[model samples]
Target: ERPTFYRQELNKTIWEVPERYQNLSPVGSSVCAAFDTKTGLRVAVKKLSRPFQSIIHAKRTYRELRLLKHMKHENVIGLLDVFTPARSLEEFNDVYLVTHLMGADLNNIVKKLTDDHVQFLIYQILRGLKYIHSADIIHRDLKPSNLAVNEDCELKILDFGVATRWYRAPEIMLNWMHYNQTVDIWSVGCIMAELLTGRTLFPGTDHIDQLKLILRLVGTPGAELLKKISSESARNYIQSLTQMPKMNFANVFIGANPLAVDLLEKMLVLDSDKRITAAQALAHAYFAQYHDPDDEPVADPYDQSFESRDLLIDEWKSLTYDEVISFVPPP
Candidate 1:
């Protein structure tokens, strides 16, 4: 007999989860937690809200589904299953993704982490990003909330949220026309800084102030560096600021490991072109104890042609449905 759903309500949204899953609880605005009785495992069931509300939304949904399906790494979130309550094409309006449930994200961790804890967490993050970058995809969003952790200190990157304003790269703030994987590295630097000092590295009130905060620490960019900013107005605004002196890492991140401070400095370089790559980061002295080239695996490059297509809602629905049905959970 085919499996059936048990109608349930969580956080004001109704869910029609399979009967075998129980104890649904809200984990996010559109995500719920459930236990799979059959498999004796807990899972996070995320319902994409208004997935087909716009072409942009549909495309994002499609991309996320495709990436999650293809990604396989210890430090990355695993997509275990996907489904929809719709029995007919016209009834399809929401898509559900099931993934392994993790304890708490870095944001909610109540206790402080030892230096050893900080090292391992950063290593896993970089290890995951190495695999992701090999597939020619940029995470674009790397922040504390996205890094989920278990009681054992096992960390996995999850949630493909837009790059949070605090962790955004300087080039992105400068209105650069193009960005690359280095943007992710910049975020990692910010996260590392926060981990060391228990404070946000750049807490900007607004976009303009965000740049000011960054400049205040890294010092104002020189005329040669300002020329690289694509936005004419951004460059003019930056040049108009008083020359600021770069703060010493030791003073900024008091008592932080010298090696960590060094790595953070390289990762947070103002120039994207000069920033360290994930592969290079993993080999940095700070991660010497954990860096093992033989253990770090890369992924096959992901095909991104679908992202360029301007498909209608119906087309996306069909494609999404095809993906959902293709998933076969292990018995």
Candidate 2:
């Protein structure tokens, strides 16, 4: 009969870093702390902040950390420890999650290069996404900052906080059941597109505006996705995205790689329903010449990698269904 969280520890530890990098200031305001340990291990601690608050925010954070704990993969960051404590989050702040620190995100790295390096970057990003989507956990806000590549070429899908939407899919700026993992897939396509173009595929001033930018390159929206726009706000959002001058994705990447472009279109589908699932995306023609489908999983998308032995093959294949509503921790 005890709570899994408690009052926030007042100065449990203070992070005094060299002033030069003290205010790296998390370019995107993800609201996290990256601490460097004595043993050279870096860990990023994610917590809640005010100004942009939501009700289910911590629930989403806890859900992600829970999945991180249950999941064992090379590409997934390891949850070394947790600080949920034993009290109310207010008396104690929401649980503090710690994930292994890795190097710069793919976006940061890719932004600085071109030619051969970019291809390697895209390959790893895809592999990491494929692995996570297969598990049914979507990286909805999958962008450059949420992905990392360490010195050893170990890639990881880093932050999962706001990454619940598809890469660049249309949105209503509010939560709805209609959006799903398809959003993450769209992001994958966006990131891949960015990798190819040396820029964010559809960088805009804000969410709704971003889709308009996407509308330019990827062509018009599908009727199915448009019809699903029930709310006036959603409809208005969609209308704004379409008015931008149209452009062609193929035209942008003309004579580049046809198969890759094809993959991009499928992933960036406006009809989220038509969006490909990660488990099945392997069949994409983009892999047409990706050679060695059966070869060892590559090293681009994970902070860690899983070997054949890392899987619970028996458990997965023979698992029965259960819909347990309660997920409280044991005493």
Candidate 3:
């Protein structure tokens, strides 16, 4: 008898996966959903699109794979398995990461959520973020599409690759130096606002408009704060803007819980220094009912030396191939 495999097309790439993983269907541009016969569980298999096309692309692929492999939390997506069909390092170009499949991402949910739902959702996000920040790695990209949710409302943050413009923090848009984990907090604030109102808080048309929309809501940055911006052109751009008054959260999110509004204000501060940390946000009165310090685990700090390495394309390919081969699927 001959061995058989399942064939599927993911993001224009063909994959002839093992028989144990079946019924593959497109979940995203580079992702497919399949059921694992061995585990009796469905999984999302994400293909790295042209991971070794360029040094920058290869580095990003390495970073995302490394981060996903390191993270293990209820609220964070876990990498279940990784493989490549290529048998040799010289032929290795495609990498596939298998992760737990969720019913849908938050972006696909349209139903109105109760206050409790919002609290739990936000709490879970913060709880996961606490661990991520403790690991000394910023998510850099946090958005509704990156948040996976199941029928039971269990949430898991996904897409370690990066963020969209709408959820981008002011510091990121302004190109400020040393933007930290608080950028994810700012994104959480945006997600919360959308969840509360069922509308995008900042629907900007472009980068320039994105900043304008942000400042219009958060108000103009003072000269002292503007000085912290490392990009002179960014500073000049801000200086050119007319001074604006910050909108009152209570008035903006009318009839919403005062506690939710308060937390949003803290999380959406113009200065990253003033923004609340994930640990602190988890402790806020809004989530006090669900807050359990002991239950919130922190991760060991990730070794980021590889990120700074100036490796050639082939070197990156070799490193990535090594990583792919080292993965051991659970029993």
Shift of residue 215 alpha carbon in model 2, Å: 2.1
Candidate 1 residues lying further than 4 Å off, grouped into runs, are: 160-163
List per-prediction Cα lDDT, in the order shown.
0.85, 0.54, 0.85
Best by TM-score: 1
Cα error, residue 135 of model 3, in Å, equals: 1.4
- What's each prediction's TM-score? 0.93, 0.62, 0.91
Residue 140, model 1: Cα distance from true site in angstroms: 1.7
lDDT by residue (tens digit), candidate 1, 168-224 = 997877667888899999999999888888888898887788888898888888766
> Which residue segments of model 2 deviate by more than 4 Å?
1-61, 83-96, 112-116, 160-167, 172-176, 223-247, 285-331
Which window of 10 residues has the lowest lDDT sum in candidate 2? 316-325
TM-score result, candidate 3: 0.91
245-303 per-residue lDDT for model 2 (tens digits)? 33566788775677767777677776678877654565565554443456424232332
Instruction: Decide which is better by lDDT, 1 or 2.
Output: 1
